[PDB]
């Protein structure tokens, strides 16, 4: 994983260990808003016209 | 026309001409071009900036 991704992830994990559900779920929502709902594992470098 | 040898010898030609030539040319050209270009090359802010 990237650096920022791991940062956000272990941040939510510290929120869950810190039992703060509200801030935790909001941080997860921010994560999904900030990193999209899917990670790409394949693209096709090309062009079209 | 007219003629005689006794009482009534004359001449007449009341010739007439009426001509009326009218032309009406009417030309109307109209051109209208519209053309539009677009390019994009996007940019996002990193999710961890301050
Ligand atoms: C966390 O919150 C839950 C629910 O309020 C509570 O039962 C628990 O004692 C809290 N602490 C830990 C360490 O789970």
PDB file of C-alpha atoms and ligand atoms in Angstrom:
ATOM      1  CA  UNK A   1       0.000   0.000   0.000  1.00  0.00           C
ATOM      2  CA  UNK A   2       0.986   3.617  -0.450  1.00  0.00           C
ATOM      3  CA  UNK A   3       2.056   5.823   2.419  1.00  0.00           C
ATOM      4  CA  UNK A   4      -1.033   8.012   2.604  1.00  0.00           C
ATOM      5  CA  UNK A   5      -3.278   4.975   2.319  1.00  0.00           C
ATOM      6  CA  UNK A   6      -1.645   3.194   5.237  1.00  0.00           C
ATOM      7  CA  UNK A   7      -1.788   6.458   7.170  1.00  0.00           C
ATOM      8  CA  UNK A   8      -5.539   6.792   6.718  1.00  0.00           C
ATOM      9  CA  UNK A   9      -6.043   3.098   7.418  1.00  0.00           C
ATOM     10  CA  UNK A  10      -4.124   2.906  10.675  1.00  0.00           C
ATOM     11  CA  UNK A  11      -5.767   6.206  11.602  1.00  0.00           C
ATOM     12  CA  UNK A  12      -9.176   4.577  11.379  1.00  0.00           C
ATOM     13  CA  UNK A  13      -7.680   1.654  13.288  1.00  0.00           C
ATOM     14  CA  UNK A  14      -6.522   3.950  16.082  1.00  0.00           C
ATOM     15  CA  UNK A  15     -10.024   5.408  16.083  1.00  0.00           C
ATOM     16  CA  UNK A  16     -11.562   1.963  16.519  1.00  0.00           C
ATOM     17  CA  UNK A  17      -9.095   1.011  19.255  1.00  0.00           C
ATOM     18  CA  UNK A  18      -9.891   4.389  20.831  1.00  0.00           C
ATOM     19  CA  UNK A  19     -13.545   3.272  20.683  1.00  0.00           C
ATOM     20  CA  UNK A  20     -14.657   6.584  19.095  1.00  0.00           C
ATOM     21  CA  UNK A  21     -17.142   5.109  16.637  1.00  0.00           C
ATOM     22  CA  UNK A  22     -18.489   8.390  15.257  1.00  0.00           C
ATOM     23  CA  UNK A  23     -15.099   9.860  14.390  1.00  0.00           C
ATOM     24  CA  UNK A  24     -14.039   6.423  13.136  1.00  0.00           C
ATOM     25  CA  UNK A  25     -16.932   5.945  10.734  1.00  0.00           C
ATOM     26  CA  UNK A  26     -16.586   9.534   9.555  1.00  0.00           C
ATOM     27  CA  UNK A  27     -12.897   8.935   8.894  1.00  0.00           C
ATOM     28  CA  UNK A  28     -13.791   5.834   6.892  1.00  0.00           C
ATOM     29  CA  UNK A  29     -16.318   7.844   4.901  1.00  0.00           C
ATOM     30  CA  UNK A  30     -13.637  10.444   4.246  1.00  0.00           C
ATOM     31  CA  UNK A  31     -11.299   7.648   3.162  1.00  0.00           C
ATOM     32  CA  UNK A  32     -13.795   6.372   0.630  1.00  0.00           C
ATOM     33  CA  UNK A  33     -14.400   9.906  -0.607  1.00  0.00           C
ATOM     34  CA  UNK A  34     -10.663  10.516  -0.848  1.00  0.00           C
ATOM     35  CA  UNK A  35      -9.433   7.251  -2.389  1.00  0.00           C
ATOM     36  CA  UNK A  36     -12.393   5.909  -4.346  1.00  0.00           C
ATOM     37  CA  UNK A  37     -14.294   2.668  -3.920  1.00  0.00           C
ATOM     38  CA  UNK A  38     -11.964   0.513  -6.003  1.00  0.00           C
ATOM     39  CA  UNK A  39      -8.264   0.115  -6.662  1.00  0.00           C
ATOM     40  CA  UNK A  40      -7.146  -0.516 -10.222  1.00  0.00           C
ATOM     41  CA  UNK A  41      -4.954  -3.504 -10.994  1.00  0.00           C
ATOM     42  CA  UNK A  42      -4.868  -3.263 -14.790  1.00  0.00           C
ATOM     43  CA  UNK A  43      -4.991  -0.576 -17.456  1.00  0.00           C
ATOM     44  CA  UNK A  44      -4.362  -0.574 -21.192  1.00  0.00           C
ATOM     45  CA  UNK A  45      -2.054   2.213 -22.297  1.00  0.00           C
ATOM     46  CA  UNK A  46      -3.531   3.184 -25.617  1.00  0.00           C
ATOM     47  CA  UNK A  47      -5.272   5.894 -27.548  1.00  0.00           C
ATOM     48  CA  UNK A  48      -8.397   6.197 -29.623  1.00  0.00           C
ATOM     49  CA  UNK A  49      -9.873   8.502 -32.213  1.00  0.00           C
TER      50      UNK A  49
ATOM     51  CA  UNK B   1     -56.010  53.010 -95.605  1.00  0.00           C
ATOM     52  CA  UNK B   2     -58.262  55.027 -97.935  1.00  0.00           C
ATOM     53  CA  UNK B   3     -58.677  55.963-101.616  1.00  0.00           C
ATOM     54  CA  UNK B   4     -61.219  57.069-104.208  1.00  0.00           C
ATOM     55  CA  UNK B   5     -61.422  58.847-107.551  1.00  0.00           C
ATOM     56  CA  UNK B   6     -64.737  60.675-106.974  1.00  0.00           C
ATOM     57  CA  UNK B   7     -65.097  62.111-103.454  1.00  0.00           C
ATOM     58  CA  UNK B   8     -63.138  60.291-100.709  1.00  0.00           C
ATOM     59  CA  UNK B   9     -59.388  59.699-101.137  1.00  0.00           C
ATOM     60  CA  UNK B  10     -57.381  59.850 -97.906  1.00  0.00           C
ATOM     61  CA  UNK B  11     -54.619  58.151 -95.962  1.00  0.00           C
ATOM     62  CA  UNK B  12     -54.249  57.014 -92.353  1.00  0.00           C
ATOM     63  CA  UNK B  13     -51.933  54.864 -90.219  1.00  0.00           C
ATOM     64  CA  UNK B  14     -52.612  55.174 -86.479  1.00  0.00           C
ATOM     65  CA  UNK B  15     -49.866  52.715 -85.604  1.00  0.00           C
ATOM     66  CA  UNK B  16     -49.165  52.095 -81.921  1.00  0.00           C
ATOM     67  CA  UNK B  17     -46.710  50.181 -79.746  1.00  0.00           C
ATOM     68  CA  UNK B  18     -46.769  49.406 -76.028  1.00  0.00           C
ATOM     69  CA  UNK B  19     -43.916  47.426 -74.477  1.00  0.00           C
ATOM     70  CA  UNK B  20     -43.169  46.980 -70.777  1.00  0.00           C
ATOM     71  CA  UNK B  21     -40.142  44.872 -69.849  1.00  0.00           C
ATOM     72  CA  UNK B  22     -39.727  44.265 -66.121  1.00  0.00           C
ATOM     73  CA  UNK B  23     -37.016  42.124 -64.560  1.00  0.00           C
ATOM     74  CA  UNK B  24     -36.689  41.260 -60.886  1.00  0.00           C
ATOM     75  CA  UNK B  25     -33.595  39.356 -59.852  1.00  0.00           C
ATOM     76  CA  UNK B  26     -33.440  38.591 -56.135  1.00  0.00           C
ATOM     77  CA  UNK B  27     -30.435  36.779 -54.657  1.00  0.00           C
ATOM     78  CA  UNK B  28     -29.928  35.915 -50.984  1.00  0.00           C
ATOM     79  CA  UNK B  29     -26.855  34.043 -49.752  1.00  0.00           C
ATOM     80  CA  UNK B  30     -26.533  32.973 -46.122  1.00  0.00           C
ATOM     81  CA  UNK B  31     -23.566  31.273 -44.457  1.00  0.00           C
ATOM     82  CA  UNK B  32     -23.283  30.270 -40.811  1.00  0.00           C
ATOM     83  CA  UNK B  33     -20.334  28.385 -39.327  1.00  0.00           C
ATOM     84  CA  UNK B  34     -19.917  27.316 -35.701  1.00  0.00           C
ATOM     85  CA  UNK B  35     -17.061  25.169 -34.493  1.00  0.00           C
ATOM     86  CA  UNK B  36     -15.771  24.457 -31.011  1.00  0.00           C
ATOM     87  CA  UNK B  37     -12.674  22.761 -29.564  1.00  0.00           C
ATOM     88  CA  UNK B  38     -12.049  21.218 -26.146  1.00  0.00           C
ATOM     89  CA  UNK B  39      -9.095  19.673 -24.355  1.00  0.00           C
ATOM     90  CA  UNK B  40      -8.672  18.425 -20.816  1.00  0.00           C
ATOM     91  CA  UNK B  41      -5.766  17.091 -18.736  1.00  0.00           C
ATOM     92  CA  UNK B  42      -6.905  16.818 -15.157  1.00  0.00           C
ATOM     93  CA  UNK B  43      -5.275  17.492 -11.786  1.00  0.00           C
ATOM     94  CA  UNK B  44      -6.186  16.464  -8.244  1.00  0.00           C
ATOM     95  CA  UNK B  45      -4.905  17.557  -4.856  1.00  0.00           C
ATOM     96  CA  UNK B  46      -3.154  14.829  -2.931  1.00  0.00           C
ATOM     97  CA  UNK B  47      -5.307  13.390  -0.132  1.00  0.00           C
ATOM     98  CA  UNK B  48      -2.655  14.148   2.493  1.00  0.00           C
ATOM     99  CA  UNK B  49      -1.680  17.759   1.918  1.00  0.00           C
ATOM    100  CA  UNK B  50      -1.752  20.405   4.627  1.00  0.00           C
TER     101      UNK B  50
HETATM  102  C1  LIG C   1     -15.639   0.468  24.159  1.00  0.00           C
HETATM  103  O1  LIG C   1     -17.029   0.753  24.009  1.00  0.00           O
HETATM  104  C2  LIG C   1     -17.882  -0.349  24.362  1.00  0.00           C
HETATM  105  C3  LIG C   1     -19.299   0.091  24.070  1.00  0.00           C
HETATM  106  O2  LIG C   1     -19.627   1.279  24.776  1.00  0.00           O
HETATM  107  C4  LIG C   1     -17.667  -0.734  25.823  1.00  0.00           C
HETATM  108  O3  LIG C   1     -18.455  -1.880  26.128  1.00  0.00           O
HETATM  109  C5  LIG C   1     -16.195  -1.029  26.084  1.00  0.00           C
HETATM  110  O4  LIG C   1     -15.980  -1.254  27.472  1.00  0.00           O
HETATM  111  C6  LIG C   1     -15.339   0.141  25.618  1.00  0.00           C
HETATM  112  N1  LIG C   1     -13.924  -0.129  25.831  1.00  0.00           N
HETATM  113  C7  LIG C   1     -13.242  -1.125  25.250  1.00  0.00           C
HETATM  114  C8  LIG C   1     -11.790  -1.217  25.610  1.00  0.00           C
HETATM  115  O5  LIG C   1     -13.769  -1.914  24.473  1.00  0.00           O
END
